Design a protein around this ligand. Structure first.
Ligand SMILES: Nc1ncnc2c1ncn2[C@@H]1O[C@H](CSCC[C@H](N)C(=O)O)[C@@H](O)[C@H]1O
Ligand SMILES: Nc1ncnc2c1ncn2[C@@H]1O[C@H](CSCC[C@H](N)C(=O)O)[C@@H](O)[C@H]1O
Ligand SMILES: Nc1ncnc2c1ncn2[C@@H]1O[C@H](CSCC[C@H](N)C(=O)O)[C@@H](O)[C@H]1O
Ligand SMILES: Nc1ncnc2c1ncn2[C@@H]1O[C@H](CSCC[C@H](N)C(=O)O)[C@@H](O)[C@H]1O
Ligand SMILES: Nc1ncnc2c1ncn2[C@@H]1O[C@H](CSCC[C@H](N)C(=O)O)[C@@H](O)[C@H]1O
Ligand SMILES: Nc1ncnc2c1ncn2[C@@H]1O[C@H](CSCC[C@H](N)C(=O)O)[C@@H](O)[C@H]1O
Ligand SMILES: Nc1ncnc2c1ncn2[C@@H]1O[C@H](CSCC[C@H](N)C(=O)O)[C@@H](O)[C@H]1O
Lengths: 280, 281, 280, 280, 280, 279
């Protein structure tokens, strides 16, 4: 009762277009979560983004399709949640590798907390020199990790440890326009990452590593939305993040995220690709 | 080639790998914000991607209400008409949309003429709390994020009156789970030109008091929390553009109130899609 | 070979409308079972109805979606089949409570029969005074049992034994009219159950207990068909049920089911609702 | 209101009446799929009508007529099946029945939906169709062949069908052999012939020149539909005697029980697809 | 760049129609594998047909739907792969019978190499005189094996060893025409098989064995395509097959396969049928 | 007619012929999905045409043309893919090919179905399209790029598309370098160029200005089509020699086997969706 019909009509007459400039060609919510998705535990931006992460993991599991009793290699495994879900859902063994000591200890704490230390094995190891014998894994994935490594070496190592006829799922960025030097330096100073290759350049490395390309699917909008969620979280929580990671790290993000966002929007693409080590 | 080494990368995640966990969730990868069968957008602008999520949202509402070809739907609080346009093309129905903004109704008429659907799309400035239409004129209706501007009892009783017996009204409404402080109630008027949402039982007493049966309810709170996150980020990152467009008083009010409004939304409100039936016979 | 075209035509001229008064706007069978359903073992009414009960249970399992390893509380568990199928399909532990000694015994013999006594516990314990500690179960459901209890005390007690962030599945009736006194009495004399509240009154009790409401779906026609199945079996098997339960009980049903069915059709609705205990 | 003790003692004595009538659980059956709409009302005839329509939707899906084809409805009844097929697939339908009442009711359906040029209903004999050879792209006989001489009707349908078109048939068959009272109950209740055996029926289909492409048992649907019909006739004996006479209704009340057991134990009901072969 | 537009245009002007005579009404690939099928390990004709065989098996498992803990009888089990896939997918036990000592040895070999000798039993036995007790198996299938047997005997024996209420999935051919004597001889001289019965004759046998017919689905195009796959491999590998099987057996195939394909196309149909042993 | 022992001895001696030809089982392959309709004939060209039609349905679903749009069929053949797309999506389709017999047969097809206002077929070269810039909403090149210069065709498709339009490509690629006789077979048998490498093909795509949105391997479909084709020629040599002369048929009979092996071991076939970026 605190507003009248005339006041609401005037509000939309004056400001209604602010919804079209921010939300699109309608004046209502986006369906950001599919109808079948469960209600999150809370509406915090990190919790909702976490559920979109798990649905992303489920889709990768579905795309690669690991079979029960197989052994998968998580190349650049993070803190292990991707491995935990694949193991739980498919009844597989998973081995993960990362060059971060804290990440691997957290992944081992994860497997210990769920009672899966037998099927989950997390070791500090470099993907450009894997400590595993040839043809050890039925399949493997590199989920947003190749950008930190030399792609030709890591792809060769993945080819070596795969059994012939197995598949490697990659989640990799690619440039569509040539980057300026400020943009290439943002890749290192923001994420400790390398600049992505061209699409043809990437598939020459894939082919030169001995792989066949079975599929590619663009997931660029998901990266753009994810990058927006990251940007909003850093802006709204600068004080919290400065007290944790330091003023120099946070201020680097606040000053760089805007530029890197526009570079991502205009010059790069992000895709999921299935790579097969041929049989015979 | 190769701007970093494995050791530099390993140190980076030891020190900063948690700012991904603090913002993106329990993993360190992207979210599946767009379903795999969705088309790749024309652009990666935040407004372009949100617009596509708006249309899939609209497709879900059309799917839920399920209007049949040759029916007439009343769009209560129709905005600028894109929801009505999509329903008309996909299902072969007529739509009549009402809104209290002369500007919005004008844009919806341009939309219908630009698409050649002026016969099946009618848009009119009119109040949902006093609809000019006759009794039992429409087969179905929806009020998509518009009851919050209204006296819900009047609007629901009026929607009931113009629905034929047996027809359904699709409602997308907010509700409070707490009590709301007085500053929180004022932000609804000063930011959104809206009334405070009612309590759940209070809301469905109003639904029952208007003569509706409740056939379904589905929580969509996450979609509203994400949408408000997309709105806030657009306002924060484009303050200069919006002040030159709408004036500093309007934009500064948003920059000052969006934070508290988001927390109140997250911790005190819930947002759902409900299907109400006007009983038959 | 037995009738002529003229005889058949005169038959539908005289009586064709008995199919429309009873079966609907067509003159053919209803699709009462989905095409992907198995051909039952018998065509007996209780057999067909039982398969519909299992498909009903499958839909609840799919709706509540219990995850493997969780512990579920069955409020008003009956003879335990619902708990058994949920435990078999999802790999969960179930604890069911009921005020009937004969049911709880049949439920324990059902768990022993299927070798699941380690994961199926059935006890005689009141829903309005549950004996379990706080935050004991990850999820729960009350499948057509709140109508016997005080709905404020059971819900508040289910909220108490639930872990924060857990889901409670409720299958409850609700009045749309006011109910006359002979209608309210039929609830106790036929079903030994209270009268259902109003929808707004129900969700005040749901909110007053501390629950959020995540979903509601109408299932009124399922309850209407089930009640018709029940009545048709009572009318056609009067001599057996009188010999089984006594003539007083059977005659009570034969005299009230017709009126109870009209009250159900005209004055009540039946829904499935997903209530949540908020997280921390 | 009731107490917990009163409820528990109630189920201790009468809890098993639910297991004798509803099945191995104590809750509703899922008689309507979750995606189906809420009916306009919970009257038995209104619910059964929705099951009839979903049945019709399934036949359309099974036969799969193409937009621009012409379907022949052998035994069209009051025409709703033809109407739903015409609106959903954009086809012309022609329906024949030996009842003047039914064709008048079907003609009002044709005009009432602004079709008339695509919906045609005539009084004709299926055993002597008036149409020319190779007239229809497809046809169906939905529960109508039991009133006919099957070889004559099937040969006639084969004549009017274009080469390569399909005939959907919804027919019953005996698995026992039927006593003479059971055979007579067929004529006196529903002016129809006794069903043939399975092999006998397909010998008749063979001799007419069809190829059998599919068969699917729908016996449980017929069983439930007959229970719905019996509950309606029984619970509404006064209204039906006043509209159809006492002799007709008394004949149903005395024969529906024996017809139902004979249906359950000695008959089966299916949907079959019959192809008139294309040109060699 | 080694061809020009005029040369490509002339080529299709002269030779374009050879694609329409061999491939169909278009000039592009056939969708022989569903888009969700995995990319095969290699593109050898035998490998691709093997993937098609496995998807065929997955369909029979879905159709028969054996439940975890049941015992399935494979009547004419070949070298075991179908049994192995059913045991792995449905957690069942399989007993296979064949009249070839080599195939049973290969099936026991296959069971040992997969560690499933406790759940897979393969034996040399005659389907027309099975050595198993009555009501020993919950379900069974005869996958393209009845053609070698006296169908009434095999079906009667299959009914005997089935528990009541269990199902038997049959993959059988049937003649739609009458076969000339040279055609009937090719059934013996090529495949050591009997001539298929008619459709009514087959179901007279099925009913005589005591089976109800629950479903039937045509699969004639699959068999027809499989035979084309078989003939092409024989033609294109005449020297290999003569060296391994002798010139007499290969010359018989090379002289009869063409006529066999024509008789198959014009005179027979191949279907999948579900047969139920009635419960009591 | 046969006894149990006769059948057992038969499989003891010859059962392995089924494993060498059909796979690791002794039964039929599910070549048609269960929901597919029973064909009119069991003739090979019949069943293969249904497989071609289901192929077209998949391409329609993948490109997803919307009603009212205008589609360019690059290398349209005799036009059945265009016909089905127009009837199913209510679109206009313009199709070009360098064959006069094919374009004539496509206009006949369009005329016979009463879709001459929505189906336009012209004789033209895809490497020099006669249409204006930004004239089509979408486009596809269904197994036609192997006849052309892929750089010229792709650059010319990019020119005629509107910004934001999508081009569906069905193209082959070598995974190993071909010998000189293998390269020669592409011209003698099919009048086609040798496929490029995967990375080489996508430098051409990026060079024409396209973003790559998807890729899906379809190599088994091509190998099966090439087997269905070869079996058609082998089994109907006398017919095709009367139809196309002995010189044409003898070449196919002498080259299909080698061509099949090169296909199996050195090439892959895929469907790819390329977008002309929006502004
Ligand atoms: N050279 C290298 N060898 C092994 N792991 C590496 C690596 N360079 C980076 N990584 C790892 O790759 C990961 C990228 S963050 C991605 C984490 C995880 N794949 C997820 O989806 O959540 C980090 O955990 C980092 O430790
Ligand atoms: N051009 C730009 N692009 C992105 N962010 C910008 C920007 N200009 C300013 N900003 C920053 O975006 C920030 C939004 S944070 C504002 C809300 C509040 N801090 C909260 O916790 O929710 C502002 O503090 C502003 O400094
Ligand atoms: N009292 C009232 N009567 C009719 N319309 C009203 C109203 N109060 C607000 N509205 C309208 O309700 C709309 C809410 S914004 C929602 C717009 C539209 N439903 C969409 O999906 O995009 C605005 O157009 C506003 O003008
Ligand atoms: N010999 C005959 N020739 C044509 N129609 C006949 C017939 N004998 C009976 N019928 C018609 O077949 C119908 C069977 S009742 C089935 C009606 C309709 N197919 C439906 O599904 O609702 C009756 O309406 C009757 O009039
Ligand atoms: N006050 C109470 N506390 C706990 N259980 C109760 C109760 N009152 C009744 N019940 C139980 O609730 C059950 C309702 S019948 C429902 C049975 C079961 N939930 C099923 O779905 O099949 C009865 O078995 C009864 O024993
Ligand atoms: N009389 C008989 N009793 C048992 N098996 C028989 C038989 N006559 C033939 N067979 C077997 O039936 C099989 C037919 S080949 C089919 C093999 C298997 N069913 C598969 O799907 O691959 C052969 O293995 C043959 O040995
Ligand atoms: N340079 C060129 N420009 C345009 N079309 C060409 C061409 N070179 C070959 N073609 C055409 O490309 C087609 C390849 S066969 C593919 C036909 C069609 N896409 C279908 O799926 O049925 C032939 O019709 C041929 O005429």
């Amino acid at each position: 009762q605190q507003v009248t019909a005339d006041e609401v009509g005037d509000w939309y007459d004056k400001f209604g277009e602010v919804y079209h400039l921010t939300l699109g060609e309608s004046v209502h919510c986006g369906l950001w979560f599919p109808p079948d998705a469960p209600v999150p535990q809370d509406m915090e931006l990190v919790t909702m983004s976490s559920q979109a992460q798990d649905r992303y993991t489920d889709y990768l599991i579905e795309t690669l399709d690991p079979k029960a009793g197989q052994h998968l290699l998580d190349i650049g495994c993070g803190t292990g949640r991707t491995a935990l879900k694949a193991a739980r859902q498919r009844g597989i063994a998973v081995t993960g590798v990362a060059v971060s000591k804290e990440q691997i200890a957290a992944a081992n704490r994860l497997a210990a907390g769920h009672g899966l230390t037998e099927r989950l094995t997390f070791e500090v190891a470099d993907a450009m020199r894997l400590p595993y014998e040839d043809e050890s894994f039925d399949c493997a994935w590199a989920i947003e990790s190749l950008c930190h490594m030399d792609r030709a070496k890591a792809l060769g190592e993945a080819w070596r440890v795969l059994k012939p006829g197995g598949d490697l799922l990659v989640l990799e960025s690619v440039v569509t326009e040539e980057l300026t030097e400020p943009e290439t330096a943002l890749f290192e100073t923001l994420y400790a990452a390398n600049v992505p290759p061209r699409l043809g350049e990437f598939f020459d490395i894939v082919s030169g590593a001995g792989f066949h390309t079975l599929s590619l699917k663009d997931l660029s909008a998901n990266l753009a939305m994810t990058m927006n969620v990251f940007a909003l979280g850093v802006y709204s929580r600068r004080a919290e993040f400065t007290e944790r990671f330091g003023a120099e790290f946070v201020d680097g993000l606040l000053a760089g995220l805007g530029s890197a966002q526009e570079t991502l929007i205009r010059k790069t693409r992000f895709f999921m690709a299935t790579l097969r080590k041929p049989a015979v």
